[PDB]
Coordinates of C-alpha atoms in Angstrom, one line a residue:
Chain K
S219 CA 33.4 25.2 -52.4
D220 CA 33.5 23.2 -49.1
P221 CA 32.2 25.6 -46.4
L222 CA 34.0 23.9 -43.5
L223 CA 37.2 24.3 -45.6
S224 CA 36.5 28.0 -46.1
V225 CA 36.0 28.5 -42.4
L226 CA 39.3 26.8 -41.6
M227 CA 41.1 29.1 -44.1
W228 CA 39.3 32.1 -42.7
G229 CA 40.1 30.9 -39.2
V230 CA 43.8 30.3 -39.7
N231 CA 44.1 33.6 -41.5
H232 CA 42.5 35.3 -38.5
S233 CA 44.5 33.4 -35.9
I234 CA 47.9 34.2 -37.5
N235 CA 47.0 37.9 -38.0
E236 CA 46.0 38.1 -34.3
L237 CA 49.3 36.5 -33.2
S238 CA 51.4 38.8 -35.4
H239 CA 50.4 41.5 -32.9
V240 CA 51.2 39.6 -29.7
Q241 CA 54.6 39.9 -28.0
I242 CA 56.0 36.4 -28.1
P243 CA 58.1 35.6 -25.0
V244 CA 60.7 32.8 -25.0
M245 CA 58.6 30.7 -22.6
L246 CA 55.2 29.3 -22.2
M247 CA 53.3 29.6 -18.9
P248 CA 51.0 26.9 -17.4
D249 CA 47.9 28.9 -18.4
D250 CA 49.0 28.8 -22.1
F251 CA 48.2 25.0 -22.1
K252 CA 44.6 25.8 -21.1
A253 CA 44.1 28.8 -23.3
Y254 CA 41.9 29.2 -26.4
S255 CA 40.5 31.9 -28.7
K256 CA 36.8 31.7 -29.9
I257 CA 35.2 33.8 -32.7
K258 CA 31.5 33.6 -33.6
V259 CA 30.4 35.3 -36.8
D260 CA 26.9 36.2 -37.9
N261 CA 26.2 37.8 -41.2
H262 CA 22.7 38.8 -42.0
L263 CA 22.0 39.5 -45.6
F264 CA 25.7 40.1 -46.3
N265 CA 28.8 38.4 -47.8
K266 CA 26.9 35.3 -49.0
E267 CA 29.3 34.4 -51.9
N268 CA 32.6 33.9 -49.9
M269 CA 31.6 32.6 -46.5
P270 CA 28.8 30.8 -44.8
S271 CA 26.5 33.3 -43.0
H272 CA 26.9 31.8 -39.5
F273 CA 30.0 30.0 -38.3
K274 CA 32.3 29.6 -35.3
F275 CA 36.0 29.1 -35.1
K276 CA 38.0 28.0 -32.1
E277 CA 41.7 27.8 -31.7
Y278 CA 43.1 25.7 -28.9
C279 CA 46.3 26.8 -27.0
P280 CA 47.3 29.4 -29.6
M281 CA 50.5 30.3 -27.8
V282 CA 51.7 26.7 -27.5
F283 CA 51.2 26.1 -31.2
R284 CA 52.8 29.4 -32.1
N285 CA 55.8 28.2 -30.0
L286 CA 55.8 24.8 -31.6
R287 CA 55.7 26.1 -35.2
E288 CA 58.9 28.2 -34.6
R289 CA 60.6 25.3 -32.9
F290 CA 59.8 23.2 -36.0
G291 CA 61.4 26.0 -38.2
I292 CA 58.0 27.2 -39.5
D293 CA 57.5 30.9 -40.0
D294 CA 53.9 32.2 -39.2
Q295 CA 53.6 34.1 -42.5
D296 CA 54.5 31.1 -44.6
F297 CA 52.1 28.8 -42.6
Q298 CA 49.4 31.3 -43.2
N299 CA 50.2 31.5 -46.9
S300 CA 50.4 27.8 -47.3
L301 CA 46.9 27.3 -45.8
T302 CA 45.1 30.3 -47.2
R303 CA 46.4 31.4 -50.7
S304 CA 44.5 28.5 -52.3
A305 CA 42.3 25.8 -50.9
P306 CA 43.6 22.6 -49.4
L307 CA 42.9 19.5 -51.5
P308 CA 41.1 16.4 -50.2
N309 CA 42.4 12.8 -50.9
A310 CA 38.5 9.9 -41.5
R311 CA 39.2 12.5 -44.2
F312 CA 42.5 14.3 -44.7
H313 CA 43.5 17.4 -46.7
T314 CA 46.9 18.7 -48.0
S315 CA 47.8 22.3 -48.3
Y316 CA 47.9 23.4 -51.9
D317 CA 51.7 23.7 -51.7
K318 CA 51.9 20.2 -50.2
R319 CA 53.7 21.4 -47.0
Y320 CA 51.0 20.6 -44.4
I321 CA 48.4 17.9 -43.7
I322 CA 45.0 18.7 -42.2
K323 CA 43.3 15.8 -40.5
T324 CA 39.8 15.7 -39.1
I325 CA 39.8 14.1 -35.7
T326 CA 37.2 13.3 -32.9
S327 CA 36.5 15.4 -29.8
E328 CA 38.1 12.4 -27.9
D329 CA 41.3 12.9 -29.9
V330 CA 41.2 16.6 -29.0
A331 CA 40.8 15.7 -25.3
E332 CA 43.8 13.3 -25.6
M333 CA 45.9 15.9 -27.5
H334 CA 45.2 18.3 -24.6
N335 CA 46.2 15.6 -22.1
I336 CA 49.6 15.1 -23.6
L337 CA 50.3 18.6 -25.0
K338 CA 52.5 19.8 -22.2
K339 CA 54.6 16.6 -22.1
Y340 CA 54.8 16.7 -25.9
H341 CA 56.0 20.2 -25.8
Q342 CA 58.7 19.5 -23.2
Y343 CA 59.9 16.5 -25.3
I344 CA 60.1 18.8 -28.3
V345 CA 62.2 21.2 -26.3
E346 CA 64.4 18.4 -25.0
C347 CA 65.2 17.0 -28.4
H348 CA 65.5 20.5 -30.1
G349 CA 62.7 19.6 -32.4
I350 CA 64.6 16.7 -33.9
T351 CA 62.1 13.8 -33.8
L352 CA 60.2 11.3 -36.0
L353 CA 56.9 12.2 -34.1
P354 CA 54.2 14.1 -35.8
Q355 CA 54.9 17.8 -35.8
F356 CA 51.7 19.3 -34.4
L357 CA 51.2 22.8 -35.8
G358 CA 47.6 23.8 -34.9
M359 CA 44.3 22.5 -33.6
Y360 CA 40.9 24.0 -34.3
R361 CA 37.2 23.6 -34.0
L362 CA 34.9 24.6 -36.9
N363 CA 31.2 25.1 -36.7
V364 CA 29.0 25.7 -39.8
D365 CA 25.2 25.5 -39.2
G366 CA 24.7 22.1 -37.5
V367 CA 28.1 20.5 -38.2
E368 CA 31.0 20.7 -35.8
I369 CA 34.4 19.3 -36.8
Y370 CA 37.8 19.3 -35.1
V371 CA 41.1 19.5 -37.1
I372 CA 44.7 19.1 -36.4
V373 CA 47.5 20.4 -38.7
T374 CA 50.8 18.5 -39.1
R375 CA 53.9 18.8 -41.3
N376 CA 53.7 16.5 -44.3
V377 CA 55.9 13.4 -43.9
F378 CA 56.4 13.4 -47.7
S379 CA 58.2 15.9 -49.8
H380 CA 56.5 19.0 -51.1
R381 CA 58.5 18.7 -54.4
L382 CA 59.5 15.0 -54.8
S383 CA 56.7 12.6 -55.6
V384 CA 56.3 9.3 -53.8
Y385 CA 55.6 6.2 -55.9
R386 CA 55.4 3.6 -53.1
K387 CA 54.1 4.0 -49.6
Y388 CA 54.0 1.7 -46.5
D389 CA 52.3 1.8 -43.1
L390 CA 54.1 -0.4 -40.6
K391 CA 53.1 -1.4 -37.1
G392 CA 55.1 -4.6 -36.7
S393 CA 52.1 -6.4 -35.3
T394 CA 51.9 -10.1 -34.5
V395 CA 48.4 -10.0 -35.8
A396 CA 48.5 -10.4 -39.6
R397 CA 48.6 -6.9 -41.2
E398 CA 48.3 -6.9 -45.0
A399 CA 46.7 -4.6 -47.5
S400 CA 43.4 -5.7 -49.0
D401 CA 43.2 -6.9 -52.6
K402 CA 40.8 -4.1 -53.3
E403 CA 43.3 -1.8 -51.6
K404 CA 46.3 -3.2 -53.6
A405 CA 44.6 -1.8 -56.7
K406 CA 44.2 1.8 -55.6
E407 CA 46.4 4.3 -57.6
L408 CA 48.9 5.1 -54.8
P409 CA 48.2 2.2 -52.5
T410 CA 48.9 2.0 -48.7
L411 CA 50.8 -1.2 -48.2
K412 CA 51.4 -2.8 -44.8
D413 CA 53.7 -5.2 -42.8
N414 CA 53.0 -8.3 -44.9
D415 CA 53.5 -6.5 -48.2
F416 CA 57.0 -5.7 -46.9
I417 CA 58.1 -9.0 -45.5
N418 CA 56.4 -10.8 -48.5
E419 CA 57.7 -8.5 -51.3
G420 CA 61.3 -8.3 -49.9
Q421 CA 61.4 -4.5 -49.8
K422 CA 64.8 -3.1 -49.0
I423 CA 65.7 0.4 -47.8
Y424 CA 69.2 1.3 -49.0
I425 CA 70.5 3.8 -46.4
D426 CA 74.1 3.9 -45.1
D427 CA 75.0 2.8 -41.6
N428 CA 75.4 6.3 -40.3
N429 CA 71.9 7.4 -41.4
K430 CA 70.6 4.0 -40.2
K431 CA 72.0 4.3 -36.7
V432 CA 70.9 8.0 -36.3
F433 CA 67.4 7.1 -37.5
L434 CA 67.0 4.2 -35.0
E435 CA 68.3 6.2 -32.1
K436 CA 65.7 8.9 -32.8
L437 CA 63.0 6.2 -33.2
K438 CA 64.0 4.6 -29.9
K439 CA 63.6 7.8 -27.8
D440 CA 60.3 8.7 -29.7
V441 CA 58.7 5.3 -29.1
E442 CA 59.8 5.2 -25.5
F443 CA 58.2 8.6 -25.0
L444 CA 55.0 7.3 -26.6
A445 CA 54.9 4.1 -24.5
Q446 CA 55.4 6.2 -21.4
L447 CA 52.2 8.2 -22.3
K448 CA 50.3 4.8 -22.7
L449 CA 49.9 5.6 -26.4
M450 CA 49.9 2.8 -29.0
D451 CA 48.6 1.8 -32.5
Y452 CA 50.9 4.3 -34.3
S453 CA 52.7 3.5 -37.5
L454 CA 56.0 4.1 -39.3
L455 CA 55.0 5.7 -42.5
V456 CA 57.5 5.0 -45.2
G457 CA 57.4 6.7 -48.6
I458 CA 59.8 6.1 -51.5
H459 CA 60.7 8.6 -54.2
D460 CA 62.1 7.0 -57.4
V461 CA 64.4 9.6 -59.1
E462 CA 64.4 7.7 -62.4
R463 CA 60.6 7.3 -62.7
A464 CA 60.3 11.0 -61.8
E465 CA 62.5 12.0 -64.7
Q466 CA 60.4 9.7 -67.0
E467 CA 57.2 11.8 -66.7
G468 CA 66.6 14.4 -57.5
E469 CA 67.9 16.5 -54.5
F470 CA 65.7 17.9 -51.7
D471 CA 65.9 20.7 -49.1
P472 CA 66.3 19.0 -45.7
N473 CA 65.0 22.1 -44.1
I474 CA 61.6 21.6 -45.8
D475 CA 61.5 17.9 -46.4
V476 CA 62.8 17.1 -42.9
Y477 CA 62.0 13.4 -43.0
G478 CA 64.0 12.7 -46.2
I479 CA 67.0 10.3 -46.2
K480 CA 69.1 9.9 -49.4
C481 CA 69.9 6.3 -50.5
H482 CA 73.6 5.2 -50.2
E483 CA 75.8 5.1 -53.4
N484 CA 75.4 1.4 -54.0
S485 CA 71.6 1.5 -54.1
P486 CA 70.1 -0.5 -57.1
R487 CA 68.1 2.6 -58.0
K488 CA 68.4 6.4 -57.1
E489 CA 65.9 6.5 -54.1
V490 CA 64.9 9.1 -51.5
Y491 CA 63.1 7.8 -48.4
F492 CA 60.6 9.7 -46.1
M493 CA 60.0 8.0 -42.8
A494 CA 58.1 9.2 -39.7
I495 CA 55.8 8.1 -37.0
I496 CA 52.2 8.8 -37.6
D497 CA 48.8 8.3 -35.9
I498 CA 49.8 8.6 -32.3
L499 CA 46.5 9.7 -30.6
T500 CA 45.1 6.3 -29.7
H501 CA 45.3 5.9 -25.9
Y502 CA 45.1 2.3 -24.7
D503 CA 41.5 2.9 -23.4
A504 CA 40.2 4.6 -26.6
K505 CA 41.3 1.6 -28.8
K506 CA 39.2 -0.7 -26.5
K507 CA 36.2 1.7 -27.0
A508 CA 36.4 1.2 -30.8
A509 CA 36.9 -2.6 -30.5
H510 CA 33.8 -3.1 -28.2
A511 CA 31.6 -1.5 -31.0
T512 CA 46.0 -8.7 -25.4
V513 CA 49.0 -6.4 -26.2
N514 CA 49.4 -3.1 -24.3
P515 CA 51.4 0.2 -24.8
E516 CA 54.7 -1.4 -23.5
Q517 CA 54.4 -4.5 -25.7
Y518 CA 53.4 -2.5 -28.8
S519 CA 56.5 -0.4 -28.2
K520 CA 58.9 -3.4 -28.3
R521 CA 57.1 -5.2 -31.2
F522 CA 57.3 -1.9 -33.2
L523 CA 61.0 -1.4 -32.6
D524 CA 62.0 -5.0 -33.4
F525 CA 60.2 -4.9 -36.7
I526 CA 61.7 -1.6 -37.8
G527 CA 65.0 -2.8 -36.5
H528 CA 64.8 -5.8 -38.8
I529 CA 63.6 -4.1 -42.0
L530 CA 66.4 -1.5 -42.5
Chain T
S176 CA 44.3 52.4 -23.3
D177 CA 40.5 52.8 -23.7
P178 CA 39.2 49.3 -24.4
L179 CA 36.1 50.5 -26.3
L180 CA 38.5 52.4 -28.5
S181 CA 40.6 49.3 -29.1
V182 CA 37.5 47.3 -30.0
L183 CA 36.5 49.9 -32.6
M184 CA 39.9 49.9 -34.2
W185 CA 40.0 46.1 -34.2
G186 CA 36.5 46.1 -35.6
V187 CA 37.1 48.6 -38.4
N188 CA 40.3 46.8 -39.3
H189 CA 38.3 43.5 -39.5
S190 CA 35.4 45.1 -41.4
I191 CA 37.5 46.6 -44.1
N192 CA 39.6 43.4 -44.6
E193 CA 36.4 41.4 -45.0
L194 CA 35.1 43.8 -47.6
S195 CA 38.3 43.9 -49.5
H196 CA 37.4 40.3 -50.5
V197 CA 33.8 41.0 -51.6
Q198 CA 32.9 41.8 -55.2
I199 CA 31.5 45.3 -55.1
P200 CA 28.7 45.8 -57.7
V201 CA 27.7 49.3 -58.9
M202 CA 24.4 49.1 -57.1
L203 CA 22.8 48.4 -53.7
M204 CA 19.9 46.0 -53.3
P205 CA 17.0 46.6 -50.8
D206 CA 18.5 43.9 -48.5
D207 CA 21.7 45.9 -48.2
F208 CA 19.8 48.5 -46.1
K209 CA 18.8 45.8 -43.7
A210 CA 22.2 43.9 -43.5
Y211 CA 24.7 43.6 -40.8
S212 CA 27.9 41.7 -39.7
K213 CA 28.4 40.5 -36.1
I214 CA 31.6 39.2 -34.5
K215 CA 31.8 37.9 -31.0
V216 CA 35.3 37.2 -29.6
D217 CA 36.1 35.1 -26.5
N218 CA 39.7 34.8 -25.4
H219 CA 40.4 32.5 -22.4
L220 CA 43.8 33.0 -20.8
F221 CA 45.1 34.6 -24.1
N222 CA 46.1 37.9 -25.6
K223 CA 45.4 39.9 -22.5
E224 CA 47.7 42.8 -23.3
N225 CA 46.2 44.0 -26.6
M226 CA 42.5 43.4 -26.4
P227 CA 39.8 42.9 -23.8
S228 CA 39.1 39.2 -23.4
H229 CA 35.4 39.3 -24.3
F230 CA 33.9 41.7 -26.8
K231 CA 31.4 42.0 -29.6
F232 CA 31.5 44.2 -32.7
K233 CA 28.6 44.8 -35.0
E234 CA 28.7 46.7 -38.3
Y235 CA 25.4 48.0 -39.7
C236 CA 24.7 47.9 -43.5
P237 CA 28.4 47.3 -44.5
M238 CA 27.7 47.4 -48.2
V239 CA 25.8 50.7 -48.0
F240 CA 28.6 52.4 -46.1
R241 CA 31.2 50.8 -48.5
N242 CA 29.2 52.4 -51.3
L243 CA 29.0 55.8 -49.5
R244 CA 32.7 56.0 -48.7
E245 CA 33.6 55.5 -52.4
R246 CA 31.0 58.1 -53.4
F247 CA 32.6 60.5 -51.0
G248 CA 36.0 59.8 -52.6
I249 CA 37.3 57.8 -49.7
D250 CA 39.4 54.7 -50.4
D251 CA 38.9 51.7 -48.0
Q252 CA 42.6 51.2 -47.4
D253 CA 43.1 54.9 -46.4
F254 CA 39.9 54.8 -44.1
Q255 CA 41.3 51.7 -42.5
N256 CA 44.8 53.3 -42.1
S257 CA 43.4 56.5 -40.7
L258 CA 41.4 54.7 -38.0
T259 CA 43.8 51.9 -37.0
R260 CA 47.5 53.0 -37.5
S261 CA 47.3 55.0 -34.2
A262 CA 44.5 55.6 -31.7
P263 CA 41.8 58.2 -32.2
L264 CA 42.1 61.1 -29.7
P265 CA 39.3 62.3 -27.5
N266 CA 38.3 66.0 -27.0
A267 CA 28.2 63.0 -25.8
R268 CA 31.9 62.2 -26.4
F269 CA 33.7 62.6 -29.8
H270 CA 37.0 61.4 -31.1
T271 CA 39.2 62.4 -34.1
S272 CA 41.3 60.1 -36.1
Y273 CA 45.0 60.5 -35.4
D274 CA 45.4 62.1 -38.9
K275 CA 42.4 64.4 -38.3
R276 CA 40.5 63.2 -41.3
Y277 CA 37.5 61.5 -39.5
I278 CA 35.3 62.1 -36.5
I279 CA 33.9 59.3 -34.4
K280 CA 30.8 60.2 -32.4
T281 CA 29.1 58.2 -29.8
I282 CA 25.3 58.1 -30.3
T283 CA 22.3 56.5 -28.7
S284 CA 20.4 53.4 -29.9
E285 CA 17.6 55.8 -30.8
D286 CA 19.9 57.7 -33.1
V287 CA 20.9 54.4 -34.7
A288 CA 17.2 53.6 -35.2
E289 CA 16.7 57.0 -36.9
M290 CA 19.9 56.6 -39.0
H291 CA 18.4 53.3 -40.2
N292 CA 15.1 55.0 -40.9
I293 CA 16.6 57.6 -43.3
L294 CA 19.6 55.6 -44.6
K295 CA 18.0 54.7 -47.9
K296 CA 16.7 58.2 -48.6
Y297 CA 20.1 59.7 -47.5
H298 CA 21.8 57.4 -49.9
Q299 CA 19.5 58.3 -52.9
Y300 CA 20.0 62.0 -52.1
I301 CA 23.8 61.4 -52.1
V302 CA 23.5 59.7 -55.5
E303 CA 21.3 62.5 -56.8
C304 CA 23.7 65.3 -55.9
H305 CA 26.9 63.2 -56.9
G306 CA 28.1 63.5 -53.3
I307 CA 28.2 67.3 -53.4
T308 CA 26.5 68.3 -50.3
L309 CA 26.9 70.2 -46.9
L310 CA 25.2 67.3 -45.0
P311 CA 27.4 65.0 -42.8
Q312 CA 29.2 62.4 -44.8
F313 CA 28.3 59.2 -43.0
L314 CA 31.0 56.7 -43.4
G315 CA 30.3 53.8 -41.0
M316 CA 28.1 52.9 -38.0
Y317 CA 29.0 50.3 -35.4
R318 CA 28.0 48.7 -32.1
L319 CA 30.8 47.9 -29.5
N320 CA 30.4 45.6 -26.5
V321 CA 33.0 45.2 -23.8
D322 CA 31.9 43.4 -20.7
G323 CA 28.8 45.2 -19.5
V324 CA 29.1 48.4 -21.6
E325 CA 27.4 48.7 -25.0
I326 CA 28.0 51.8 -27.2
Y327 CA 27.1 52.9 -30.7
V328 CA 29.3 55.0 -32.9
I329 CA 29.0 56.8 -36.2
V330 CA 32.0 57.9 -38.3
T331 CA 31.9 61.1 -40.4
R332 CA 34.3 63.2 -42.5
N333 CA 35.8 66.0 -40.5
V334 CA 34.2 69.4 -41.4
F335 CA 37.6 71.1 -40.5
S336 CA 40.9 70.6 -42.3
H337 CA 43.3 67.8 -41.5
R338 CA 46.2 70.2 -42.1
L339 CA 44.9 73.8 -41.5
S340 CA 44.1 74.7 -37.9
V341 CA 41.0 76.4 -36.9
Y342 CA 41.2 79.3 -34.5
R343 CA 37.5 80.3 -34.3
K344 CA 34.4 78.1 -34.4
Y345 CA 30.7 78.8 -34.6
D346 CA 27.6 76.6 -34.3
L347 CA 24.6 78.4 -35.8
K348 CA 20.9 77.4 -35.8
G349 CA 19.3 80.7 -36.5
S350 CA 16.8 80.3 -33.6
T351 CA 14.3 82.9 -32.4
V352 CA 15.1 81.5 -28.9
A353 CA 18.2 83.3 -27.6
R354 CA 21.3 81.2 -28.4
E355 CA 24.5 82.4 -26.9
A356 CA 27.6 80.7 -25.6
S357 CA 28.0 80.5 -21.8
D358 CA 30.5 82.8 -20.0
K359 CA 32.1 79.6 -18.7
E360 CA 32.1 78.4 -22.3
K361 CA 33.5 81.6 -23.8
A362 CA 36.7 80.9 -21.7
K363 CA 37.4 77.4 -23.1
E364 CA 40.5 77.2 -25.2
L365 CA 38.9 76.7 -28.6
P366 CA 35.3 77.8 -27.7
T367 CA 32.1 76.9 -29.5
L368 CA 30.4 80.2 -30.1
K369 CA 26.7 80.5 -31.2
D370 CA 24.2 82.8 -32.9
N371 CA 24.4 85.8 -30.5
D372 CA 28.2 85.8 -30.5
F373 CA 27.9 86.2 -34.3
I374 CA 25.2 88.9 -34.5
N375 CA 26.8 90.6 -31.4
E376 CA 30.5 90.5 -32.4
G377 CA 29.8 91.5 -36.1
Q378 CA 31.5 88.5 -37.6
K379 CA 32.0 88.7 -41.3
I380 CA 32.7 85.9 -43.8
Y381 CA 34.6 87.2 -46.8
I382 CA 33.8 85.0 -49.7
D383 CA 33.2 86.1 -53.3
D384 CA 29.7 86.2 -54.8
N385 CA 30.3 83.0 -56.9
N386 CA 31.3 80.9 -53.9
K387 CA 28.5 82.5 -51.9
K388 CA 25.7 81.7 -54.4
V389 CA 27.0 78.1 -54.9
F390 CA 27.1 77.6 -51.1
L391 CA 23.6 78.8 -50.5
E392 CA 22.2 76.8 -53.4
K393 CA 23.7 73.6 -51.8
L394 CA 22.5 74.7 -48.4
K395 CA 18.9 75.1 -49.8
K396 CA 18.6 71.6 -51.3
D397 CA 20.2 70.0 -48.2
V398 CA 17.9 71.8 -45.7
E399 CA 14.8 71.0 -47.8
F400 CA 15.8 67.4 -47.8
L401 CA 16.2 67.5 -44.0
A402 CA 12.8 69.3 -43.5
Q403 CA 11.2 66.6 -45.7
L404 CA 12.5 63.8 -43.3
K405 CA 11.0 65.8 -40.4
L406 CA 14.5 66.4 -39.0
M407 CA 15.5 69.5 -37.1
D408 CA 17.8 71.0 -34.5
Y409 CA 20.9 70.8 -36.8
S410 CA 23.6 73.5 -37.1
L411 CA 25.8 75.1 -39.5
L412 CA 29.2 74.6 -38.2
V413 CA 31.6 77.4 -39.3
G414 CA 35.4 77.2 -38.7
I415 CA 37.9 79.9 -39.5
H416 CA 41.6 79.3 -40.3
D417 CA 43.8 82.4 -39.9
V418 CA 46.7 82.1 -42.3
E419 CA 48.7 84.8 -40.5
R420 CA 48.3 83.4 -37.0
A421 CA 49.2 79.9 -38.3
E422 CA 52.5 81.3 -39.7
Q423 CA 53.2 83.0 -36.3
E424 CA 53.5 79.7 -34.3
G425 CA 48.0 78.7 -46.5
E426 CA 46.5 76.5 -49.3
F427 CA 44.4 73.4 -49.0
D428 CA 43.6 70.2 -51.0
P429 CA 39.9 70.6 -51.9
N430 CA 39.8 66.8 -52.4
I431 CA 40.6 66.2 -48.7
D432 CA 39.3 69.4 -47.0
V433 CA 36.1 69.3 -49.0
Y434 CA 34.3 72.0 -47.0
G435 CA 37.0 74.6 -47.4
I436 CA 36.2 78.0 -49.1
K437 CA 39.1 80.5 -49.7
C438 CA 38.4 84.2 -48.8
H439 CA 38.1 86.7 -51.6
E440 CA 41.1 89.0 -52.5
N441 CA 39.8 92.0 -50.5
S442 CA 39.5 90.1 -47.2
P443 CA 41.0 92.1 -44.2
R444 CA 42.9 89.0 -43.3
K445 CA 44.0 85.8 -45.2
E446 CA 41.2 83.4 -44.1
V447 CA 39.9 79.9 -45.0
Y448 CA 36.4 78.9 -44.0
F449 CA 35.1 75.4 -43.4
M450 CA 31.3 75.3 -43.3
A451 CA 28.9 72.3 -43.1
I452 CA 25.7 71.0 -41.6
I453 CA 26.1 69.0 -38.5
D454 CA 24.0 67.1 -36.0
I455 CA 21.1 66.1 -38.1
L456 CA 19.7 63.0 -36.2
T457 CA 17.1 64.7 -34.1
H458 CA 13.7 63.8 -35.3
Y459 CA 10.9 66.1 -34.2
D460 CA 9.6 63.4 -31.7
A461 CA 13.0 62.6 -30.2
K462 CA 13.6 66.3 -29.3
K463 CA 10.3 66.3 -27.4
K464 CA 11.5 63.2 -25.5
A465 CA 14.5 65.0 -24.2
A466 CA 12.5 68.2 -23.4
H467 CA 9.9 66.3 -21.3
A468 CA 12.8 65.0 -19.0
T469 CA 6.4 75.6 -30.7
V470 CA 8.5 75.5 -33.9
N471 CA 8.4 72.3 -36.2
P472 CA 10.7 70.9 -38.9
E473 CA 9.3 73.2 -41.6
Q474 CA 9.7 76.3 -39.5
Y475 CA 13.2 75.4 -38.4
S476 CA 14.1 75.0 -42.0
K477 CA 13.1 78.6 -43.0
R478 CA 14.5 80.2 -39.8
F479 CA 17.8 78.4 -40.5
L480 CA 18.0 79.5 -44.1
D481 CA 17.1 83.1 -43.4
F482 CA 19.8 83.5 -40.8
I483 CA 22.6 81.9 -42.9
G484 CA 21.3 84.0 -45.8
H485 CA 21.8 87.1 -43.7
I486 CA 25.3 86.4 -42.2
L487 CA 27.2 85.8 -45.4

């Protein structure tokens, strides 16, 4: 239906098949972080029903992302299946793989330049923490061209569960500036609530002290890493699965729903939480470029950690 | 090893996979005879071991050749397997699929223009005779580019058997001009003998009168079709399999070795023959272009049929 979507699927299919033939070494070389693969297709009077007639597909740093997927426990055949067996669904734009495992977000060429800028340090951080992190798990990055339109996409692991539905959803920054959902927003089906909605509506997260301490330790290292790269304006995304409400119309695989945390036994309701850092690709400078048409990366870091520290 | 060979294999693999997704109708449209598919690949600092870094692959009239392969009883998955599972072997240049089913010949852009010129009438002739013909069975036509070198290839069904080895081999034109193998040639391992070697060495083909009559009827229609398109300078290729000599160091599947004809029961030796027309792409004009640096297409036709008429 959507031609840019068909190119992406075609492109991912192609990219994984190509890599299935490559010998994968344990390590990445400096060149791998500068590598890419380009395919340009021209069909004249042929294959009109499936694909656009003229398109380009570019994959950035294929070896680095192949390395990352494995580190994040993701098999290439499964990634391929999730993205190609049936179209991703819409809901900048984002799409979800038909099986709800992966998110595909459309980003700017500026975002792509920034991703390239941090990719090596991101990778080393992922190595250092053995892939145990609240940061986005970046799984692939592509450029799509279909006759006049060029778009860039990044693929991440879904923060939420692929099985367990989320009934309530928060986006927290811990900003001094008043963050609150709009009244038009508060009436969307699955709204995206913000910092005020949390402080105001006395939302509680019922997790035991061991899960709480582990979470905040992870969070601390992650946010310090982000501050260090002068990145800011990211959020904690928090989703809540109500086991009772799901039975009306609750265990999860922690190897697929990696961000899940069960509630403790004294929780007022049987709840599963999914919490992760999202939206990291705003460099201090790029935020100023969107503002033109007082708090820095270091401040943002502390503000963020205090707030999350308080709410759990 | 040979990069042009790797591109071809990669290209055929790609082409068949693409077509596996297309809905194949029973008929071809006029546009199908003008169609093509182009892929241009650029790998920067990636995948150096398997493939050249920069290459192009073009497939001419993919739907027509998909239609032809099925008409000639060839499944797309098998064609793909034969051409990609292991490299074709060398022996203008020609190559043989590792399983000996298909021949890959390198041809000029002039040959490609001529193939395009007759492709539609070739196809209609193949329809008319239900694929029962001594003409080459054209299965695919491609253009390969690897950094500075451009080559064109055509794929045909092997005249000879994929199982049964050929010990003697003739190329017959029935020309008034003296055709004979060279004395340097006559000492090659599996030499390519010609018209004189046949008349001179009293070669006999021991086939019964029913097989003989059927063969010559086919031959007659085929050569008339060729004369009609002003094509000439083609040969009858004749290969002989000696069942005895093959046991020293003999039935065949007529659905794979389609050009095979068993000897009759009174043959001095247990022999299988493989006979077919080859090398059809010389148009009257193109032969004159190679001669510059008396007999026409109609004459050639008669000369050819008389000679083959005499030798069986």
